[PDB]
């Protein structure tokens, strides 16, 4: 067989069918007989490529393979790349290389130093020796995408290689059973279990692997047990509890200080799939009161290694959270009562206040919508008034890295038809992979996109006012049209003015056919 | 004085005033202060915003300074990289970094390894190890970027550094003046010189090089004395010679076979500012025929070590090129038999034929416009049709990397307001940098985009049809309507749905004032 | 208190005391003020130290400190690095930095890009942002290099920092604990231990991170519940099992063709604490034969992806062979039938045959002795001729790399006072590391090393004959007398050209107090 059909064989039999991709000359030798078996989602531009395909790994829990041209196609994506790394999203990046007899003359399309070009934001970069080792190069970013802890791979494949012999043996590849779902041995997690329950006022902070892992519920179980007030760690990509569940206290503020005082009086704090961790603001000082001891679970030993306090357990998040949840002693202890839910904000009938938008979203979305966020200015207000009661509820740029979320959200719609996805987007946001609204047009993937227009970098001119910047260019947006920009690229467009406007638009959407862009005029 | 002080004074002593960006808060602490005598171009997009630097530097013929953040700015940056890395582009590419005491724990928005992040796509890259140093680091770049061969830079600052004491010793930086305009020792300069004169046969290629170092006069001077056919290396980033020159030949193909069989008979040929080749298709053959000697003037050691076959000089493309034209010998050989003329094609009453397009920007552009090219499958018949007589009048993707015609040559544009700039862009690659649009009409760049809508990746449906693939996917981008992107971003938009409304639209474009997009409907393939 | 004071602190906390060096100018800063409570280990060649610093991690099985001189100090160990990765070892390489001041204007001894210079050879490289970052990058590497799986890490100093103020909030790294002592979930491993329990005719394969964890105790048991014959992974760098336990059939060859067929039949073949597989010569083939089903427990995510055949699980070997010993059923199979004894084979009055000179140490060394193997071209004779009944009694070069006995077989006689260490080292590979004769001498380190003199590189020798390779230049070394070399460096010295003078030798050897080298005369 050749290395074509190997490879296509390999691919379905790990349970890859679907390739998101930007094509080119280097790669239609792998794209030419397309399997029928299979999907190719297109995408204009590859950051757009890469964010659809991360969106739809994050939300379906299983690899995502993608399809990039060269060094300049891969590079165009490597702002993606730096956000799929930090939500440890598994992604099978292939690139096409040049033919074999042409790459010594560097010629047009040539990938040169191909496996250093995404480093450091890949787990595994590669380019075969000979087209016969392609199946097994193969099989190997799959397995380093897969295992704990999981992200992006790099492959390059010179396009004179698919139509090669496969060395036969490639056979066994096509049905390895690779696992890392491991936990900490019986006599140490008997250890961690007593510590636990011998905890006078134990927390617990989750992190974005909790959701990976579809640990949810046993988090929700684990948390009932030991009475805990459960926190989302900082700097959030993901929902791993429900926010309207009693013990649930919200996302903890990204700095030093805050989080040690936050935490300050409690005597065992637990942190399972949470870098410790992902600090953003400049708040310099104790990284845990005395008092507090620390001790995290994560499936990244990068993570264990660079955590400043605390001890860790480096596993997988699905079965920790598992065994956790049901070997603690139920205490006795009050659970914890329910925060207030979120104070009415005045609105008037000027422009909107980001707290109005929200509050708006949460009365009229479905139950079990799925929210991303790109509006870093709002973060804090959508954590406090979304009820967001099941898994996969919520995607933001891991990295920080703009471009995430438009093109994410066409991803997480279409591993979830049933599910309504609702992204809502800076104006500022909303540019960096605007393109990637053709591909919800063309595959009839019907994501609604809430753009919130203030006309600024909103984050930015608020950050510049806390360190009394004065004279800095660059912060303003005005002048863009982004009904027209839908229009552009065949998806319908709304208008929101104010609060009434606003609830139309939403009713309109919900029930519209297609992908709907609403614009929303809001107060900076 | 601080670092933030010390190192805006060394930018400007070295000639820059211009930063173009799209910020993040890493970068504040090096943004605020602005100084009075800069200017900053913002963009929506990293790409956007290198492409239009990119654009700029090329036509200006001086480095540009660039500002993004961290590493998903630089790393959405990374395609406009690959071209720039091929055109030899002179970009100072700086990025913020986290504050040094948060490095440590990886705290968001923090650039892992940095350095490694654009490589292998930078002459240099590097993180300073203190704010002090950060001057001196700065001026490395510059200087990096600067020296032959050109190319881009990478530096990252942590954003504490800016405010920081920068070193009392950074004095000696501001001033320094590194030069690499160099030429071949006379002994064996001389030596070159008595092969030229010697051939009976030369003949010239000329790469891009020639035209960043505005050569084109002196390689014009060169070709008349020789009386030498003169070709354009494959795969032409820039145009280094006019195109109704009648030493002039045309643009090579990008094949091995096909180019040594353009080169049969000739005795010497002479490569100059070009890698030796920049093939793409697969087009097995020799290297060159027997018979042919070639040798080839570079300013990178990397061409050099690469080509094939030939001999090869290291040097500086304005300096040799300007020796030679004035050492070699006037040859009393014929010129070059006239090359034909290209065919008009028969336009019917519809959709464009691209040659019926280029026919007619020839006809009704100014002799000093400028061209950018990213409509992929029709290269050779633009090359064919337009007549471009002076320098610095064609860029293209030098990696092939799409996305970057369309913030080009807003930076173009920027370069040379006296000068018409007219992009021809397929469709497809109108997409990937888009946004620039937005750059064009804050800022007024005048900016002529013409969009080839022939709703496909047209070249890519050749080359799966030359390879007789059969069920590829993703070739098709139909349901663009590019008046309404235009109008998304604030650029006025004009439709040419066929001849009479081209010429129209045209028309009215070269007369307005603002930037201007035209779709055009053309044939699909 | 300072960055050296915080560091120091820290070490000792986490449990180092000794630091292997080669000091120079970049370093001083560090080494001044040496605790009292840590001891230093000088050799003259950083190889060396490398060296010496692996033998010891290896079987203390904990991590070993390091300290070299920039870059050419690190350029120097490079090759010391390669079996360091390839063996797990867990090392921490900290290499001096010039002054942070002249690092931009490249003063002497400043190493340029530093953190490239290791790689690909180190788990983690790094150079920290400033002198207070740097008790935290230590901590990141001690926690790195400790981890499963184990490895080198680097880290450079800029030689100022250590001066300077520390951060107050490092005392939170000085007992962190961080554990990945894991092992597969309940569930998959019920169904791991059924497929074992069904087995008609299972297989054993057991790798160096065996007997880097101490699980060969364990392993034997497995062995003896599952009545299973047990081999060693090709290219073996440690002995994971007692050779002349009744299971034990040998070192695997390091073939495609030769291992598939050695396991035909084998329904299942469980692998531990090994690469699939570390073959070596071309003999290619099937990589397992039909009916054969292979299950691979690894520590290394890097291992299970490049596995071209069977399943895989990533996780503690200790852990998991702990596990699997005391979960499996008795099975009621015959307990398989010792290999029999080596054949004596004809030696003459003249040049020692190497079968000799191993039944000659294995009748006379001690039962816990601990060997090292650096001679190539009699390695299969070793295995088969030496009785090692111990765990921690094995090491060779786990790259290939020449220069690691002599050494490390310092480093292991350092960790292990009361076990013989025997290096066993040919003629040629003797050269490579040879200065590390020095570190012995001045520590009284009773290591002995034996030479096998041939006069050649006999391995290449033999390899030229199987390629019919004719007219190979530099495959003879003679002209070496390994008496003055040992003298040369302080070392006792004895010579041995025949089985007589081998015996009085080693009788010698065996009582002597400090180290002692036997040059002995083999044929070829
Ligand atoms: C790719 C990328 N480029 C630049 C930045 C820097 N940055 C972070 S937030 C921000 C402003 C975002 O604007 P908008 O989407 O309007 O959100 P708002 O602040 O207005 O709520 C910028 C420019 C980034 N984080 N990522
Ligand atoms: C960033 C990037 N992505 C993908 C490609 C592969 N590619 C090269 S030409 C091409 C088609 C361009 O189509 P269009 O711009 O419409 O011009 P046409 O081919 O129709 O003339 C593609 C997809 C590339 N060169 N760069
Ligand atoms: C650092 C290094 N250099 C070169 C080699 C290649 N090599 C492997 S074995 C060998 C010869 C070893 O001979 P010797 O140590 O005398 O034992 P013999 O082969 O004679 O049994 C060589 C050169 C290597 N493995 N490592
Ligand atoms: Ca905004
Ligand atoms: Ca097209
Ligand atoms: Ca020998
Ligand atoms: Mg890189």
Same mark, same amino acid.
């Given at each position: 067989?050749?290395?074509?059909?190997?490879?296509?064989?390999?691919?379905?039999?790990?349970?890859?069918?679907?390739?998101?991709?930007?094509?080119?000359?280097?790669?239609?030798?792998?794209?030419?007989?397309?399997?029928?078996?299979?999907?190719?989602?297109?995408?204009?531009?590859?950051?757009?490529?890469?964010?659809?395909?991360?969106?739809?790994?994050?939300?379906?829990?299983?690899?995502?393979?993608?399809?990039?041209?060269?060094?300049?196609?891969?590079?165009?994506?490597?702002?993606?790349?730096?956000?799929?790394?930090?939500?440890?999203?598994?992604?099978?990046?292939?690139?096409?290389?040049?033919?074999? @007899?042409?790459?010594?003359?560097?010629? &047009?399309?040539?990938? =040169? *130093? /191909? %496996? $250093?070009?995404?480093?450091?934001? #890949?787990?595994?970069?590669?380019?075969?020796?000979?087209?016969?080792?392609?199946?097994?190069?193969?099989?190997?970013?799959?397995?380093?995408?897969?295992?704990?802890?999981?992200?992006?791979?790099?492959?390059?494949?010179?396009?004179?290689?698919?139509?090669?012999?496969?060395?036969?043996?490639?056979?066994?590849?096509?049905?390895?059973?690779?696992?890392?779902?491991?936990?900490?041995?019986?006599?140490?997690?008997?250890?961690?279990?007593?510590?636990?329950?011998? @905890?006078?006022?134990?927390?617990?902070? &989750?992190?974005?692997? =909790? *959701? /990976? %892992? $579809?640990?949810?519920?046993?988090? #929700?179980?684990?948390?009932?047990?030991?009475?805990?007030?459960?926190?989302?760690?900082?700097?959030?990509?993901?929902?791993?509890?429900?926010?309207?569940?009693?013990?649930?206290?919200?996302?903890?503020?990204?700095?030093?200080?805050?989080?040690?005082?936050?935490?300050?009086?409690?005597?065992?704090?637990?942190?399972?799939?949470?870098?410790?961790?992902?600090?953003?603001?400049?708040?310099?000082?104790?990284?845990?009161?005395?008092?507090?001891?620390?001790?995290?679970?994560?499936?990244?030993?990068?993570?264990?290694?660079?955590?400043?306090?605390?001890?860790?357990?480096?596993?997988?998040?699905?079965?920790?959270?598992?065994?956790?949840?049901?070997?603690?002693?139920?205490?006795?202890?009050?659970?914890?009562?329910?925060?207030?839910?979120?104070?009415?904000?005045?609105?008037?009938?000027?422009?909107?206040?980001?707290?109005?938008?929200?509050?708006?979203?949460?009365?009229?979305?479905?139950?079990?919508?799925?929210?991303?966020?790109?509006?870093?200015?709002?973060?804090?207000?959508?954590?406090?008034?979304?009820?967001?009661?099941?898994?996969?509820?919520?995607?933001?740029?891991?990295?920080?890295?703009?471009?995430?979320?438009?093109?994410?959200?066409?991803?997480?719609?279409?591993?979830?038809?049933?599910?309504?996805?609702?992204?809502?987007?800076?104006?500022?946001?909303?540019?960096?992979?605007?393109?990637?609204?053709?591909?919800?047009?063309?595959?009839?993937?019907?994501?609604?996109?809430?753009?919130?227009?203030?006309?600024?970098?909103?984050?930015?001119?608020?950050?510049?006012?806390?360190?009394?910047?004065?004279?800095?260019?660059?912060?303003?947006?005005?002048?863009?049209?982004?009904?027209?920009?839908?229009?552009?690229?065949?998806?319908?467009?709304?208008?929101?003015?104010?609060?009434?406007?606003?609830?139309?638009?939403?009713?309109?959407?919900?029930?519209?056919?297609?992908?709907?862009?609403?614009?929303?005029?809001?107060?900076?």
């Amino acid at each position: 067989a050749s290395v074509h059909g190997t490879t296509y064989e390999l691919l379905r039999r790990q349970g890859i069918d679907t390739v998101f991709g930007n094509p080119g000359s280097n790669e239609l030798p792998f794209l030419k007989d397309f399997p029928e078996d299979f999907r190719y989602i297109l995408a204009l531009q590859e950051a757009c490529v890469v964010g659809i395909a991360d969106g739809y790994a994050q939300a379906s829990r299983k690899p995502a393979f993608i399809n990039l041209h060269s060094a300049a196609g891969t590079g165009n994506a490597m702002g993606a790349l730096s956000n799929a790394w930090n939500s440890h999203s598994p992604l099978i990046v292939t690139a096409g290389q040049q033919t074999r @007899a042409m790459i010594g003359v560097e010629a &047009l399309l040539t990938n =040169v *130093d /191909a %496996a $250093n070009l995404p480093r450091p934001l #890949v787990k595994w970069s590669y380019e075969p020796a000979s087209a016969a080792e392609v199946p097994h190069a193969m099989s190997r970013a799959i397995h380093m995408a897969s295992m704990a802890p999981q992200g992006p791979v790099y492959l390059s494949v010179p396009y004179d290689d698919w139509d090669k012999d496969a060395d036969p043996q490639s056979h066994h590849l096509f049905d390895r059973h690779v696992s890392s779902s491991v936990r900490l041995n019986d006599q140490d997690l008997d250890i961690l279990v007593k510590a636990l329950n011998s @905890a006078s006022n134990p927390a617990i902070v &989750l992190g974005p692997d =909790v *959701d /990976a %892992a $579809n640990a949810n519920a046993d988090c #929700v179980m684990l948390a009932e047990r030991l009475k805990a007030p459960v926190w989302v760690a900082p700097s959030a990509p993901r929902c791993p509890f429900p926010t309207r569940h009693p013990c649930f206290r919200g996302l903890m503020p990204a700095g030093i200080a805050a989080i040690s005082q936050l935490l300050e009086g409690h005597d065992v704090v637990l942190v399972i799939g949470a870098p410790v961790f992902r600090y953003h603001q400049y708040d310099p000082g104790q990284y845990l009161k005395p008092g507090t001891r620390l001790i995290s679970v994560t499936c990244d030993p990068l993570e264990a290694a660079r955590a400043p306090m605390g001890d860790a357990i480096v596993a997988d998040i699905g079965a920790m959270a598992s065994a956790l949840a049901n070997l603690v002693e139920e205490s006795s202890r009050q659970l914890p009562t329910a925060a207030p839910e979120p104070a009415k904000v005045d609105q008037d009938a000027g422009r909107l206040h980001p707290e109005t938008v929200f509050d708006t979203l949460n009365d009229m979305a479905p139950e079990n919508a799925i929210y991303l966020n790109e509006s870093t200015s709002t973060t804090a207000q959508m954590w406090q008034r979304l009820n967001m009661r099941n898994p996969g509820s919520y995607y933001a740029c891991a990295a920080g890295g703009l471009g995430f979320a438009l093109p994410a959200a066409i991803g997480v719609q279409l591993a979830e038809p049933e599910r309504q996805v609702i992204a809502v987007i800076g104006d500022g946001s909303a540019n960096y992979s605007i393109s990637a609204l053709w591909t919800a047009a063309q595959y009839n993937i019907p994501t609604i996109f809430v753009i919130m227009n203030n006309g600024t970098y909103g984050a930015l001119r608020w950050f510049a006012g806390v360190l009394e910047a004065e004279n800095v260019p660059g912060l303003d947006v005005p002048g863009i049209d982004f009904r027209a920009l839908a229009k552009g690229y065949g998806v319908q467009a709304l208008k929101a003015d104010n609060l009434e406007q606003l609830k139309g638009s939403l009713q309109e959407a919900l029930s519209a056919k297609g992908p709907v862009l609403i614009e929303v005029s809001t107060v900076s």
